[PDB]
Amino acid sequence: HPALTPEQKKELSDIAHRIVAPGKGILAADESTGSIAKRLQSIGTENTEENRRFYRQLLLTADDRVNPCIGGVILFHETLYQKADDGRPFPQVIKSKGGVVGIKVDKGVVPLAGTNGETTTQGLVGLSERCAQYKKDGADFAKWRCVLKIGEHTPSALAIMENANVLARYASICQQNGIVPIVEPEILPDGDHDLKRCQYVTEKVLAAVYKALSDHHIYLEGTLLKPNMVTPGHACTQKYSHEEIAMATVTALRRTVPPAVTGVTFLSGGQSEEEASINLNAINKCPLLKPWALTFSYGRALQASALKAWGGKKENLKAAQEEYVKRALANSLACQGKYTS
Amino acid sequence: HPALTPEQKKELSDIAHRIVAPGKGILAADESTGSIAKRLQSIGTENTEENRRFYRQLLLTADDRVNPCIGGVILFHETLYQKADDGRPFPQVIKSKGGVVGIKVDKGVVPLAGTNGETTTQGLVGLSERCAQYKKDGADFAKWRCVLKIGEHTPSALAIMENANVLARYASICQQNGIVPIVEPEILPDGDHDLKRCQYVTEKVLAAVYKALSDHHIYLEGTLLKPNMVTPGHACTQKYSHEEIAMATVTALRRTVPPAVTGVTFLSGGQSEEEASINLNAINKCPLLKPWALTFSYGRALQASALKAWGGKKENLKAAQEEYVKRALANSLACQGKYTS
């Protein structure tokens, strides 16, 4: 569509920069019902709209200690339209604490015909209308997740090309509607591959992603990247230090992400809460030159303990918030390379 | 070909870093006979092997004031095999002054069939053998020049793809032979296009170049980029300040060149000696974050006055060297953002 005006670019750049301002990261609370369903059953809690509303309220209304730690919060569409007990729409709750409101806009992963168990992501249909609507309703940034898997002959060239193209189309539509797109090309940790294999694949995928964004004239200063850290496979037989993980990650990014990108907000994948903080901290202590903010966009890494403490019981509200606050503070320090465990 | 070993990567990275070390740039003296022919006729001097040898000797033997300014010198194959009056091979002369020896390995531009006056570059045939030979004979880096032109419907997608692919193939062959490749995708200033048009095309070309390098598994830390600065067309009807030129240039680079690239060594194109220094200085004063050295790889911008002062007369030797030394010092300060005219 038509090229962006100076005003449109300024809006996008300002939004992107506020989300990843020094010491800040993103709370990824955008689990769909199917996704949140599994989280709730793990704590023997009924997956109902009210319990989902209460849980999101619990996270969003944590005390002001999280304000300097949380630059943005990603929501699922249901939550974008829910209200706290005091009548305030959740987007208002988020903004009153200094956070930018985000909205997941993809509609899940689906099989990519002809491939060996590979996938693509659906949701481009009606995306422009949804973005305009979400913008009107309080959201300033969005998120779209694509998944790639490392295997004998995967990810294939077809899968990489397909997913990078979709991310670029999504990003263009977002910017046309004044929304900062967070591009998430997640490479699963599944498999027995080693660290260098993950690094190689990550470099291949990100290169495809940015060429695709270029092809679609995406304003990079008005975007964020949410990639996987470079780690050994979940079934890898070799052990790696946090330093090796940090070096592999920063190197992969330096070899592929243009300096114009405003920030990188890592997903935690299957890492434990502390592991995710330690690795992010190590990434920020790496002496190499890094031209973009290196921070967090964590779901489980910020919520695991809180969800467990809550247990679906209202009396556990404050205890649950405390677990979340502790992780928010930890990661706020980690994205500054100042976290000490 | 086979992936590089840690030793091979270290060699390439070390070479690349020495060439663009703080305050240093490149003297591009790699004019072929046909190219140097026009330079010599401009000063009423016979284009003979001896006059070419004497002129190159004049530049290479300038006094030690150029040592901290010149990190590398690009030569044409003829010169790589010539000797100074004292019997020292020119590569030895260059190295004894702290410079790295470079060698142009492309064999000129030729028409790209089917396009509207567009070109590609020849020389891939036998390139591996030449690189190995040049490495043995003293060269540690190389240069390959591709040319793109801005017009109504140019550069075309075909021309961009073709030239980026050739540069990537050249770069791979260089690294396999221990030579640091300088990738030069020059976008001519010819035409009445404005500054933003040049910026857009430069961004498009560089994005294609780096995707191509990625596709060929090029070790970026062991490479340098020699692009055109972003300027208005030679026949543009609008005037632009040095600040606007610097901003457009740095922005184009930030949007496309991965931080892993060790350095950017600008070509001067048709800019005057002082214009090239002023613009490089402005580029280095730009507050934006720049993860790579921003320096010079100048031919005419370092030689124009020297060639004129020499005039083909041996008695003008020192006067000619002084003209060159003055420009070397100017650009050495410019690549540090410390040049004041």
Swiss-Prot record, chains A, B:
<feature type="modified residue" description="N6-acetyllysine; alternate">
    <location>
        <position position="38"/>
    </location>
</feature>
<feature type="modified residue" description="N6-(2-hydroxyisobutyryl)lysine">
    <location>
        <position position="143"/>
    </location>
</feature>
<comment type="similarity">
    <text>Belongs to the class I fructose-bisphosphate aldolase family.</text>
</comment>
<feature type="modified residue" description="N6-malonyllysine; alternate">
    <location>
        <position position="107"/>
    </location>
</feature>
<feature type="modified residue" description="N6-acetyllysine">
    <location>
        <position position="326"/>
    </location>
</feature>
<dbReference type="GO" id="GO:0006096">
    <property type="term" value="P:glycolytic process"/>
</dbReference>
<keyword id="KW-0456">Lyase</keyword>
<feature type="modified residue" description="Phosphothreonine">
    <location>
        <position position="5"/>
    </location>
</feature>
<keyword id="KW-0597">Phosphoprotein</keyword>
<feature type="binding site">
    <location>
        <position position="300"/>
    </location>
    <ligand>
        <name>beta-D-fructose 1,6-bisphosphate</name>
    </ligand>
</feature>
<comment type="pathway">
    <text>Carbohydrate degradation; glycolysis; D-glyceraldehyde 3-phosphate and glycerone phosphate from D-glucose: step 4/4.</text>
</comment>
<feature type="modified residue" description="Phosphoserine">
    <location>
        <position position="128"/>
    </location>
</feature>
<feature type="modified residue" description="N6-acetyllysine; alternate">
    <location>
        <position position="107"/>
    </location>
</feature>
<dbReference type="GO" id="GO:0004332">
    <property type="term" value="F:fructose-bisphosphate aldolase activity"/>
</dbReference>
<dbReference type="Pfam" id="PF00274">
    <property type="entry name" value="Glycolytic"/>
</dbReference>
<dbReference type="InterPro" id="IPR000741">
    <property type="entry name" value="FBA_I"/>
</dbReference>
<feature type="site" description="Essential for substrate cleavage">
    <location>
        <position position="69"/>
    </location>
</feature>
<comment type="function">
    <text>Plays a key role in glycolysis and gluconeogenesis. In addition, may also function as scaffolding protein.</text>
</comment>
<keyword id="KW-0704">Schiff base</keyword>
<keyword id="KW-0379">Hydroxylation</keyword>
<feature type="modified residue" description="N6-acetyllysine">
    <location>
        <position position="104"/>
    </location>
</feature>
<keyword id="KW-0007">Acetylation</keyword>
<dbReference type="GO" id="GO:0051289">
    <property type="term" value="P:protein homotetramerization"/>
</dbReference>
<keyword id="KW-0832">Ubl conjugation</keyword>
<keyword id="KW-0324">Glycolysis</keyword>
<feature type="modified residue" description="Phosphoserine">
    <location>
        <position position="32"/>
    </location>
</feature>
<feature type="modified residue" description="Phosphoserine">
    <location>
        <position position="35"/>
    </location>
</feature>
<dbReference type="InterPro" id="IPR013785">
    <property type="entry name" value="Aldolase_TIM"/>
</dbReference>
<feature type="active site" description="Proton acceptor">
    <location>
        <position position="184"/>
    </location>
</feature>
<feature type="cross-link" description="Glycyl lysine isopeptide (Lys-Gly) (interchain with G-Cter in SUMO1); alternate">
    <location>
        <position position="38"/>
    </location>
</feature>
<feature type="binding site">
    <location>
        <position position="39"/>
    </location>
    <ligand>
        <name>beta-D-fructose 1,6-bisphosphate</name>
    </ligand>
</feature>
<feature type="cross-link" description="Glycyl lysine isopeptide (Lys-Gly) (interchain with G-Cter in SUMO2); alternate">
    <location>
        <position position="38"/>
    </location>
</feature>
<feature type="active site" description="Schiff-base intermediate with dihydroxyacetone-P">
    <location>
        <position position="226"/>
    </location>
</feature>
<dbReference type="GO" id="GO:0031430">
    <property type="term" value="C:M band"/>
</dbReference>
<feature type="modified residue" description="Phosphoserine">
    <location>
        <position position="268"/>
    </location>
</feature>
<dbReference type="GO" id="GO:0031674">
    <property type="term" value="C:I band"/>
</dbReference>
<feature type="modified residue" description="Phosphoserine">
    <location>
        <position position="42"/>
    </location>
</feature>
<dbReference type="GO" id="GO:0030335">
    <property type="term" value="P:positive regulation of cell migration"/>
</dbReference>
<protein>
    <recommendedName>
        <fullName>Fructose-bisphosphate aldolase A</fullName>
        <ecNumber>4.1.2.13</ecNumber>
    </recommendedName>
</protein>
<keyword id="KW-1017">Isopeptide bond</keyword>
<keyword id="KW-0963">Cytoplasm</keyword>
<dbReference type="GO" id="GO:0034316">
    <property type="term" value="P:negative regulation of Arp2/3 complex-mediated actin nucleation"/>
</dbReference>
